[PDB]
Paper text:
The examples shown in the Methods section ascertain that SeU can be successfully and conveniently used as a practical and easily applicable vehicle for phasing novel crystal structures of macromolecules by the SAD (or MAD) approach through the anomalous signal of selenium. The use of SeU as a provider of anomalous signal for the SAD phasing has been examined on crystals of several proteins and a nucleic acid.
Residue numbers in the entry: 59 to 87, 99 to 326
The structure:
């Protein structure tokens, strides 16, 4: 297992703290691009000051590393949910993931306006603001509360797949971004289904959801993996996350991907 997780947490939390400071000045005062750049720059200042050998892939400026390669890769998105940010809606989030040879070992979802921070760590239960959180059981897809960001954020076949699961759930809801994954981790949402998600908007979710007892994969039900390198391309993935493995299963059958 990894031995440096507490030290990784402290820098993780400082990165997140520094992103928050930038984000709160620009939220509700184009501010979004200044915010997104400054915030990313703030996080890499912290991460690279504490670990010079480490690499980062940020949503604004891609890969950045001194060395040829690194065993440790920081995948960042300061504002996951730019449309929410632009419209004054405080459900966007800063996402921080640390990858050890391509496996995520830490993830943060921070909401700096709501002052809510979910940390996921390998081999620990996921916490929200220092308190342990847990997904909830849910019998059947008909009992499930579902979130997706948008309906026409699906093209052609993805929209058919999505419709199939949509018709079976208790109620489909829209318009959290990453917050919906935070909510599911805390046991308030049963299922999140999305298409066209870039790595810096899902890698942080994995330890958060998994350490809460939930499951998150692609539409085929495979492990969400993205090996970040200097020669890495941020390509779209499809994501299904559930509080309950039975629900995940059942969702996978409706997706027919």
């Amino acid at each position: 297992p990894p031995h440096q997780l507490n030290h990784f947490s402290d820098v993780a939390n400082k990165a997140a703290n520094a992103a928050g400071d930038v984000i709160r000045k620009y939220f509700r005062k184009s501010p979004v691009t200044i915010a997104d750049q400054s915030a990313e720059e703030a996080m890499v200042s912290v991460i690279l000051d504490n670990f010079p050998s480490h690499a980062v892939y940020g949503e604004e400026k891609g890969w950045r590393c001194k060395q040829d390669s690194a065993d440790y890769v920081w995948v960042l998105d300061p504002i996951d949910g730019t449309k929410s940010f632009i419209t004054g809606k405080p459900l966007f989030g800063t996402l921080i993931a640390l990858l050890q040879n391509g496996t995520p070992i830490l993830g943060i979802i921070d909401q700096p306006v709501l002052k809510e921070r979910w940390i996921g760590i390998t081999g620990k239960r996921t916490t929200l603001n220092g308190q342990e959180v847990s997904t909830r059981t849910c019998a059947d897809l008909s009992q499930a509360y579902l979130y997706t960001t948008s309906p026409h954020l699906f093209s052609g076949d993805a929209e058919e797949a999505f419709i199939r699961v949509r018709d079976k759930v208790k109620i489909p809801l829209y318009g959290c971004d990453c917050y919906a994954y935070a909510l599911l981790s805390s046991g308030f949402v049963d299922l999140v289904v999305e298409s066209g998600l870039k790595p810096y908007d899902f890698l942080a979710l994995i330890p958060v959801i998994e350490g809460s007892g939930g499951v998150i994969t692609d539409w085929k039900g495979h492990q969400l993996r993205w090996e970040a390198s200097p020669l890495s391309i941020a390509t779209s993935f499809n994501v299904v996350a559930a509080g309950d493995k039975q629900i995940h299963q059942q969702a996978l059958d409706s997706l027919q991907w």
